[PDB]
């Protein structure tokens, strides 16, 4: 940390040291400077991870605003759902037959979508109401009295 | 080589990428003055000294992209909430339609049994058995 | 330490989402206590249709009979 | 920190769901839809139940939901 | 945003800067023109997404009317 942050001071210190050292060797050092500095991949990994941690601690600042907007949208959709619930639960207060009729229509629509699907459906032959002696045949009609 | 490298390294070690980008005039003045001073000793005039190609690390590019996308997300969400409001309107409308349908059917069914449900069950059984009658991947196993 | 700062921001952004969910639940509960839970049945049917459509293209989804 | 956030969330959310927890059922439906969306493009081998298709209209369980609505 | 929406201002400012700079070099700068400008694909993706947001806010306006008609069908 000190070396990189104070690279100039270390550079001038080593300049003085090298010139005084080589002076006895009759060698004038016109200019002494540092050309490259590299560390083990682990130290550089650590510093990069420090930078990425700072970046993520900053990114949380945008995550919170995204959360704010999502909260607003959630409240809007929930207002819609609450109004729908109050305006539709009063209808089914008397007799919820519409739910059964809607269920039948949804079964028909699901059949329409499945017919062209790519799954492997395994329905139950009871869907074909072909077994006319099963003692469940009169269940639906028996329920009407 | 030596003078250029030393001048650039000394100039840049003073600050960081954010400070480097924010004040181009400061870094330009520093590099120009330092290079002129260094070349004064070596007697080489610098007709023009200009740094003109800046490229940072991927980390700072990602940080800048996050900073920009924050404001862009704000701008786009300002309209996404409007879209959600319109969807809430169009869902209250559908809820009103369904509620009116349920009101009609409940009024007609409370007083008059629910035979229509059974008749529609038979009709839907026929219709579904026809609809699935072409798919080759539908199998009918026996009840239990 | 910076991860702790990130966790503080995440706690803030989770309290915000919790407030949103709590407001939604408050609205829906105020509606449903007085009205009744028929909207839930209607949404069940709509979601059954929607899911049956969504899974209608995957070839690795299979529908075995009930029980 | 995380537990502080969770406890503060739980306070308000439980206060909301004190009266009637319908929002949980609606959220469950929405989560089912989202799970279906993610599964549709997944690589798993899913084996659902044909009951998901509400095609068996004659089964005794057909009128269950409406029965619970009275 | 300012650079594009006020492209004329930056263009003429750079024109004046180039004229003054090259004046010392005995070069007359007849005209300075910005022939092209591009950004990273991410910024253009963001602006495309802004247009997407506006058109979604319009598609919702159409969906509400579609919902009205569907309500009439249901009734």
Author numbering:
A (entry chain g): 151 to 295
B (entry chain H): 120 to 263
C (entry chain G): 197 to 263
D (entry chain f): 226 to 295
E (entry chain h): 151 to 225
Copied sentences from the primary study:
Stomatin, Prohibitin, Flotillin, and HflK/C (SPFH) family proteins are found in all kingdoms of life and in multiple eukaryotic organelles. Most SPFH assemblies also abut a cellular membrane, where they are implicated in diverse functions ranging from membrane organization to protein quality control.
The major structural changes between the closed and open PHB1/2 complex conformations occur at the SPFH domains and the adjacent CC1 region (up to PHB1 V200 and PHB2 V214 in the CC1 helix; rmsd = 9.783 Å), while the C-terminal portion of the PHB1/2 complex remains largely unchanged (rmsd = 0.708 Å). In addition to the increased diameter of the ring formed by the SPFH domains in the open PHB1/2 complex, the diameter of the ring formed by the N-terminal ends of the CC1 helices increases from ~102 Å in the closed conformation to ~114 Å in the open conformation. This is achieved through a ~ 7.8 Å shift of the N-terminal end of the PHB1 CC1 helix, which corresponds to a clockwise rotation of ~5.5° around the C11 axis when viewed from the ‘bottom’ of the cage. This translates to larger differences in the relative positions of the SPFH domains, without inducing significant structural changes within the domains themselves. Most of these SPFH domain interactions are lost in the open PHB1/2 complex. Most of the interactions that involve residues at the membrane-proximal end of the CC1 helices, including the hydrogen bonding network with the β6-β7 loops, are disrupted in the open PHB1/2 complex, consistent with the larger conformational differences at the N-terminal ends of PHB1 and PHB2 between the closed and open conformations. Like in the Erlin1/2 complex, hydrophobic and aromatic residues in the SPFH1 domain of both PHB1 and PHB2 contribute to membrane anchoring together with the N-terminal transmembrane helix. This hydrophobic interface does not change between the closed and open conformations.
